[PDB]
Amino acid sequence: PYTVVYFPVRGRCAALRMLLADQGQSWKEEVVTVETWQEGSLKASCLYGQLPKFQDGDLTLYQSNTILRHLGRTLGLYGKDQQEAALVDMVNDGVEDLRCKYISLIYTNYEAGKDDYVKALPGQLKPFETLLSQNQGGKTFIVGDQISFADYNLLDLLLIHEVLAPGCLDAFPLLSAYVGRLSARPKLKAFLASPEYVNLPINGNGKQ
Amino acid sequence: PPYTVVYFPVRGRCAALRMLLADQGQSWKEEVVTVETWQEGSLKASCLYGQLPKFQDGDLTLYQSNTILRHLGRTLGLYGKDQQEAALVDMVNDGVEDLRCKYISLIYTNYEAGKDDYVKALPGQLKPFETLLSQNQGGKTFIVGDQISFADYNLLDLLLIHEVLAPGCLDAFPLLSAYVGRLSARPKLKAFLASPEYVNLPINGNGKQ
Ligand SMILES: N[C@@H](CCC(=O)N[C@@H](CS)C(=O)NCC(=O)O)C(=O)O
Ligand SMILES: N[C@@H](CCC(=O)N[C@@H](CS)C(=O)NCC(=O)O)C(=O)O
DSSP, X not given: OEEEEEOSSSGGGHHHHHHHHHTTOOEEEEEOOHHHHHHOHHHHHSTTSOSOEEEETTEEEEXXXXXXXXXXXXXXXXXXXXXXXXXXXXXXXXXXXXXXHHHHHHHHOHHHHHHHHHHHHHHHHHHHHHHHHTTGGGTSOSXXXXXXXXXXXXXXXXXXXXXXXXXXXXXXXXXXHHHHHHHTSHHHHHHHTSHHHHXXXXXXXXXX | OOEEEEEXXXXXXXXXXXXXXXXXXXXXXXXXXXXXXXXXXXXXXXXXXXXXXXXXXXXXXXXXXXXXXXXXXXXXXXXOSSHHHHHHHHHHHHHHHHHHHHHHHHHHHSHHHHHHHHHHHHHHHHHHHXXXXXXXXXXXXXXXXXXXXXXXXXXXXXXXXXXXXXXTTTTTOHHHHHHHHHHHHSHHHHXXXXXXXXXXXXXXXXXXX
């Protein structure tokens, strides 16, 4: 069915795992240890030399956001029509931009750059608060009336930022309630409480 | 429509979508934002992520360069023939964006001290696109499938700006080299790429390239 090939971290696979779990899908995790990675054969076979790698039947994919968009397209989590699909992309690309900055903080400048990052964070979260504000009072999903792949990515994004800077959502009522509502979904709640999520580090260097 | 492109007077993250629009017979308005106007702050505060490009398609306002490309990709028939092709198109675009991200960081934050090592690492960054071409009809067509996609325009722009940064960087990659020559020769795109329009804008906003 579906196969996720990645290191034993949440990282760039947390959102697509949340998606698969919440949509009732089954998948196989193939965990790559770092000692297997430094051997070099798997990395050499990876299109961009990186993980994650994903299998959907006989279709092999790389890029975390390609995986999300593919699941969105094939499972119907991409909006109701081309205009909503564009808005879904606009949210996901915004999520990706902040994740990229988060990853840079974690791996290359945590100690010295955290203060600084945290101070900039409210300005980085407000666009998502604004998007919720413009969609049914923030009472449903980031775009439209149904969940999309961007909701799962946004949710992961918010969760890891709550760990980095607890209380960071206190200034954003719609985002705070949105985290609460999505996290309470029955399948996602079960997954987020499970050892396969809880006992993985967010990032590869233990920093969070 | 015409569409509207709101951007600084730079090629930057609008080069690919403009090439797409020009090659696909579309009409659009360029609303150029000067430094003076941007720094006044009204427009910026009105942008969803505080940044440009902003794109108008009728009543639909979009931000994010890659959202604009995907929107034009799906509405103009440049996203592959089926769901499989669409996923491969995304995989290419995401790889383009990753390397564009590294290019922009070099240009704006570390150009003088970092350009040397960036060009040294560049063959490793181009090889995946050569590999993708080798697996699609011997590199003789497009990056995905046998019709042009929005990822072709983004990859072409990425390759072109890298040829400015490091001339001859594609000489070691015969399929990418032929691909660039082939796409650049598509007559409407060729006319656009030789136009004032394109030629008279700097690649980046800080004068480095
Ligand atoms: N843009 C890619 C980035 C993938 C990426 O950064 N992978 C890292 C782990 S999160 C990796 O494989 N590092 C090992 C290496 O580059 O050698 C995506 O979203 O999947
Ligand atoms: N991820 C965004 C990045 C947009 C971006 O970086 N915009 C820059 C120009 S390329 C900008 O607006 N700088 C002005 C500012 O941030 O105030 C996209 O792809 O559109």
